[PDB]
Amino acid sequence: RMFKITACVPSQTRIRTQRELQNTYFTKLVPYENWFREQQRIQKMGGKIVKVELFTGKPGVNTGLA
């Protein structure tokens, strides 16, 4: 059940001379198992979670999950 997510990762830890746009703003497909762990990590990093969609799977399915 891959979740399509859109998120930001502003970082005050350092000022980066190399490219940072790629990591800063991104959309990724995160599987259902990973999403809670990733949600907690990005929320801890303090980035704003702009958007979430259920790219694969169905909103509710008792069995037959991906």
């Binding site: 907690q40 801890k44 979670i49 259920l54 909103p59």
Partner: protein, 161 residues
Amino acid sequence: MQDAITAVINASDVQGKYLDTAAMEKLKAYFATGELRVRAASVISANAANIVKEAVAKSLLYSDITRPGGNMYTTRRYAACIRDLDYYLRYATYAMLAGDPSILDERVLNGLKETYNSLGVPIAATVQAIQAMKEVTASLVGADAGKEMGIYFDYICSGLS
């Protein structure tokens, strides 16, 4: 990721002004309340599992949502629901210890509404359930600490709503 002290100094920093006597009054009030907050946190932690069990029993159990085709039917979904309530309680006590709602917004409510609607989790039912948690917690921590617990519980309710 802020507490009461961080919020006070950051607000003064946004103004650009130095620490004011009114700002220090806010800091004094938080310090005076600090010990009360700490003991409440210990009680919440020790009885956290029981708080969740009692609140779920009084709010969600023996109802249509736990009945088949109700979004908490199936063991996997029931486990996720109780886990989410556990996390709500833990982040609530973090916010209570901080004396600020910043943690709730930064680490809980962000994306929570979007994810819950994406999966169609019943947001009204969750709000009712955490209100049940709120009264159980009020009984355990006491009236004084319960009022502080209440504002952060209601803050989470507002974010879900």
